[PDB]
Amino acid sequence: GPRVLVVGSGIAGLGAAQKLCSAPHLRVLEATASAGGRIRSERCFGGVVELGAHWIHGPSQDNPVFQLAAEFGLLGEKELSEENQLVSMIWSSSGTSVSLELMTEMARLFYGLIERTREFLNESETPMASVGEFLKKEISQQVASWTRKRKLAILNTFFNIECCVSGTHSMDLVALAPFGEYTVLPGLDCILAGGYQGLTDRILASLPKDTVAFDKPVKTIHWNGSFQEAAFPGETFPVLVECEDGARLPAHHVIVTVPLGFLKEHQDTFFEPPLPAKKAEAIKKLGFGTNNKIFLEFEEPFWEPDCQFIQVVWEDTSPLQDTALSLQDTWFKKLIGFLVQPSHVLCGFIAGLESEFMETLSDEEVLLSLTQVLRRVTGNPQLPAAKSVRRSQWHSAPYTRGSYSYVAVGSTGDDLDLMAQPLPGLQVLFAGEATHRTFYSTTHGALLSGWREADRLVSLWDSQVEQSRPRL
Numbered sequence: 001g002p003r004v005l006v007v008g009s010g011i012a013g014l015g016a017a018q019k020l021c022s023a024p025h026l027r028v029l030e031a032t033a034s035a036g037g038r039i040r041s042e043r044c045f046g047g048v049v050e051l052g053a054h055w056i057h058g059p060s061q062d063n064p065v066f067q068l069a070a071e072f073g074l075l076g077e078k079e080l081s082e083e084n085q086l087v088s089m090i091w092s093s094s095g096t097s098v099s100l101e102l103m104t105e106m107a108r109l110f111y112g113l114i115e116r117t118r119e120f121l122n123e124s125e126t127p128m129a130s131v132g133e134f135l136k137k138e139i140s141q142q143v144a145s146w147t148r149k150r151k152l153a154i155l156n157t158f159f160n161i162e163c164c165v166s167g168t169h170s171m172d173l174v175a176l177a178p179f180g181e182y183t184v185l186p187g188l189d190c191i192l193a194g195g196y197q198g199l200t201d202r203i204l205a206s207l208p209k210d211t212v213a214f215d216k217p218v219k220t221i222h223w224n225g226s227f228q229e230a231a232f233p234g235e236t237f238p239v240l241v242e243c244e245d246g247a248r249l250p251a252h253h254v255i256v257t258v259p260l261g262f263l264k265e266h267q268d269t270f271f272e273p274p275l276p277a278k279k280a281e282a283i284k285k286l287g288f289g290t291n292n293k294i295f296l297e298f299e300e301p302f303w304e305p306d307c308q309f310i311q312v313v314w315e316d317t318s319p320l321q322d323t324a325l326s327l328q329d330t331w332f333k334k335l336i337g338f339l340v341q342p343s344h345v346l347c348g349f350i351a352g353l354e355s356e357f358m359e360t361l362s363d364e365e366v367l368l369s370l371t372q373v374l375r376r377v378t379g380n381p382q383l384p385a386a387k388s389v390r391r392s393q394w395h396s397a398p399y400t401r402g403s404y405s406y407v408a409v410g411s412t413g414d415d416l417d418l419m420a421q422p423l424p425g426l427q428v429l430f431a432g433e434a435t436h437r438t439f440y441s442t443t444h445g446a447l448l449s450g451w452r453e454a455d456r457l458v459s460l461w462d463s464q465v466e467q468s469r470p471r472l
C-alpha cells in the first residue's frame with residue numbers, strides 16, 4: 001500500500017504504527033538502539049529503574065495507557081482496583097524534622113493558589129505573564145497578613161516540586177492563561193512494577209516483523225517534491241527521507257514524532273524546504289525543560305521501612321527571592337527530595353538549569369555530593385556513603401535535549417495545535433507529547449497523538465476512491 005515512514009519509536013510513533021499496520025508499506029526509523037524513547041526502563045541494582053516516564057498519571061478508564069497496561073498484564077490488583085481508579089519524612093537542611101501540621105498548612109496555601117490559575121483561562125492580555133508571578137504576588141499578600149522564614153522555605157520546596165511537574169527551570173517561565181488547559185484524569189498514580197518499557201515493548205511486538213529499524217537516525221525530510229524511486233520504472237513520491245547513514249527512502253507520508261528539544265535544535269536542517277513560519281515559531285516559543293532522576297543504592301536503608309519519600313526543605317530560601325532565570329545557591333538545593341524505590345534505593349528528582357548542571361558532573365561528584373546532602377539534612381554525619389549511582393541525563397541526550405514540553409511565557413495552547421498541524425497533502429504529519437493540547441508532557445498524550453495521526457491518514461486513504469467518482 002502507500003509508503004509511510006514513522007520517525008521515532010517512542011509511544012507516539014509506536015501507537016501510530018500499530019493503528020496503521022492493522023495495508024501500508026510502513027517502517028519506523030529509530031535513532032537509538034531500542035524503542036521507548038522517554039519511556040526507558042533499565043536493569044540496575046539487580047532490579048529495574050525508570051530513567052524517564054515513571055507513573056501512569058491518572059490510571060482510570062479514559063487513560064489509554066492504563067487500558068493497555070491492564071490488557072497486557074502489567075498492573076497489579078491495587079492498581080487495577082475500583083478504589084485506586086477513583087482517587088513521607090520531611091527534613092530541613094538544619095538537620096531537623098518539619099511539622100506535618102505546618103507542611104499541611106503550606107501545601108493548602110500553595111495548592112489553593114495553583115487552583116486559582118484557572119481564573120486566567122482564555123484571557124488575551126493577562127495582568128501577569130506567568131504562573132510564578134501570580135503565585136509570588138499572592139504569597140506576598142498572605143505574608144503581609146502573618147516562623148515566617150520557615151514557612152517561606154517550605155513554600156520554596158513546593159515551587160521546586162512544581163518545576164519538576166511542569167518540566168521547567170522556574171514557574172516564572174510557565175504561561176499563566178494556558179496553564180489550566182492541562183487535564184488531569186482521575187486515579188492514584190501508579191508505576192508498572194516490571195518497567196514502563198514493558199508497555200512499549202508489547203506495542204512494538206504486535207507490529208509486523210521488522211517494522212522498527214534501530215540505529216537509523218533521520219537527517220532530513222525532503223518534502224513538496226516529485227521524487228523518483230531508485231528502481232525501474234521510477235514511481236514518483238512527494239517525500240524523500242534522508243538518513244544519517246546516507247539511505248534515501250521515498251515515502252508518500254512521514255509521521256514525525258521526534259521530541260520538541262530535537263526540533264528546537266535541528267528544525268532548520270531537518271526539513272527541506274523549511275517548515276511554514278507559524279510552525280517554526282511554535283517550536284521556538286514552546287517550553288522544553290529538563291527533569292532528571294538520580295538513583296542512589298545503599299548497602300542498608302537509613303530510612304524507616306514504611307517511608308516512601310524523603311522530602312527536603314532548604315532553610316532560609318524563599319520563592320519571593322527567585323526570578324525566572326535565577327539559580328539556587330548550589331545545584332543540589334533544587335533537588336526536591338528522594339522517593340524510596342519499592343535492595344535499598346532512593347530516587348532523587350531535580351528540574352531546571354541546576355538539573356542540566358548535574359548532568360555535566362561525573363557520577364563520582366553526584367554520589368559524593370548527595371551523600372554529604374543526606375548527612376546534612378538527616379543530621380547524621382556518620383550516614384554511610386551511597387554504594388552506586390545511576391542518573392538520567394535528558395538534556396544531554398542528542399535525540400531528545402530535555403524531558404518534556406510546557407506552554408512557556410510567550411506561547412499558548414494554540415501553539416500545541418500548530419505543532420499538530422499537518423503539512424499539505426499530509427506529506428508530513430506530527431505526533432508526540434508536544435502536539436497534544438491537553439495531555440502534553442505525558443505518555444498517554446503521546447499515545448493519543450499517534451492514534452490521531454493514524455486516523456488522519458486513514459481518512460485520506462479512504463477518500464482517494466472519491467477522486468474518481470463523477471457527478472453524472
Ligand SMILES: Cc1cc2nc3c(=O)[nH]c(=O)nc-3n(C[C@H](O)[C@H](O)[C@H](O)COP(=O)(O)OP(=O)(O)OC[C@H]3O[C@@H](n4cnc5c(N)ncnc54)[C@H](O)[C@@H]3O)c2cc1C
Pocket residue numbers: 007008009010011012013029030031032035036037038039051052053054055056057216217218219257258259262291292293392394399400402403404431432433434440441442443444446
Ligand atoms: C524524566 C522524565 C519523567 C517523566 N515522567 C512521566 C511520568 O511519570 N508519566 C508520564 O505519563 N509521562 C512522563 N514523562 C513524559 C513522557 O515520557 C513523554 O511525554 C512521552 O514518553 C513522549 O513520547 P513521544 O513518543 O512523544 O516521544 P519520545 O518517547 O521521546 O520518542 C521520540 C523518539 O524519536 C527518536 N528520534 C529523535 N530524533 C530522531 C531522528 N532524527 N531520527 C529518528 N528517531 C529520532 C528518539 O530517539 C525517540 O525514541 C516523563 C519524561 C521524562 C524524560
